[PDB]
């Protein structure tokens, strides 16, 4: 388990959740959102050594493999295992609309 | 849609499914399987430029983002999307057992 509760609380060198703030206007040009002005949809990065939160048997077997054949270029990558929504507030004309965007924020990570 | 049916018929440079044969003993040290002697579990490799098989909205945002700020080092990764099972044959004492290991082979890939 490599989530906010652990990744943030430490200084992990390998696969972990990394904080990142994205401003709707400034970083996506989305001039349609009203609030927030942005959000913390993080990302993942860092090496995936043998047996590090392997996603599937595959992610495991490829793990052991790349461990012995470093120059074969098949090291499982670090990708979001958990994503959470992000309530937003945008206006449709002159009416408040409070919807919930899905798979917007990375809450934890794995080596797939 | 980056599947065998496509990544294998074109010499792709970006994210795509790469072929890989894993011999059970020589590569994994599993002196416990009878047949097969190995199998084609594949892997994924290669850059994930904006607009390239986005697993989620996040992957899209993280793609559209990392493009304008490669310096942050948050480019989404290439990871298995659809995985098929591999049946095997192993012996318990002398009784033969044919079981199907799940999530063992990669058929399609996405950028997460």
């Amino acid at each position: 388990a490599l989530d906010t509760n652990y990744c943030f609380r430490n200084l992990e060198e390998n696969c972990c959740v990394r904080p990142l703030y994205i401003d709707f206007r400034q970083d996506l040009g989305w001039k349609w959102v009203h609030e927030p002005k942005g959000y913390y949809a993080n990302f993942c990065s860092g090496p995936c050594p043998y047996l590090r939160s392997a996603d599937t048997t595959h992610s495991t077997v490829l793990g052991l493999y790349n461990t012995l054949n470093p120059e074969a270029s098949a090291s499982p990558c670090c990708v979001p295992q958990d994503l959470e929504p992000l309530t937003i507030l945008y206006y449709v004309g002159r009416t408040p609309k409070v919807e919930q965007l899905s798979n917007m924020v990375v809450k934890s990570c794995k080596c797939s | 849609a980056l599947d065998t049916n496509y990544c294998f018929r074109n010499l792709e440079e970006n994210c795509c499914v790469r072929p890989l044969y894993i011999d059970f003993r020589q590569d994994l040290g599993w002196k416990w399987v009878h047949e097969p002697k190995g199998y084609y579990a594949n892997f994924c490799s290669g850059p994930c430029p904006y607009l390239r098989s986005a697993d989620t909205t996040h992957s899209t945002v993280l793609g559209l983002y990392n493009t304008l700020n490669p310096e942050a080092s948050a480019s989404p990764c290439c990871v298995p999307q659809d995985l098929e099972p591999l049946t095997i044959l192993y012996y318990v004492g002398r009784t033969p057992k044919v079981e199907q290991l799940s999530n063992m082979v990669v058929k399609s890939c996405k950028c997460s």
Partner: antibody
Amino acid sequence: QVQLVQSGAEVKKPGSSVKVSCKASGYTFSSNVISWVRQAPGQGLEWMGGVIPIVDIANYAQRFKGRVTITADESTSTTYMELSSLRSEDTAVYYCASTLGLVLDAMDYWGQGTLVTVSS
Amino acid sequence: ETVLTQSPGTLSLSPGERATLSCRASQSLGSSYLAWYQQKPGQAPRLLIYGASSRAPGIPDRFSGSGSGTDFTLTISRLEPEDFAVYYCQQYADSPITFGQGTRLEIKR
């Protein structure tokens, strides 16, 4: 500067469905909500509905609340306006335009248009 | 649901005169939710004014909008020839977006 290129005109049989498309020049597709407005022969403009890119949430004018469908594909960097249960009345010029910023704003960038003719 | 009614139906004027189009909303619009477009025969609409009195990029100075609430007016001070066409008002204060029945400004000769 943003360019919008809709598909070419189309002739259709009543009861069938047409799928027009709008081509966006990449650097502005992900940051612009897109509306679709059609225009009947010698008639006024009718806002049909629209959609926000990436998040893929679209809203349609009640009039087409059940047969129009606007979607986007960032990869193809285009947005599709699929109208089914075609009627003769549906025959008109279907324009696709990007709003200034909000889901319901004025529209500054349009397409060339797309003549969808419904005839037997 | 929200009906815009432009007037006059047709406005024939000579090049140079001051053109004054109107648009009346069934409901109140804010000070910044109406718009003006011009349509040349066989062409997509061209955005002229948004909100109101807010000139869209690249639009000439002679094009000035104004108004609030229910009555809005678009005024072309010195009528050039590439100004005689069709003009529609659009509102975006309350879904659905809605245009006017249009106004035909043509050459008086």
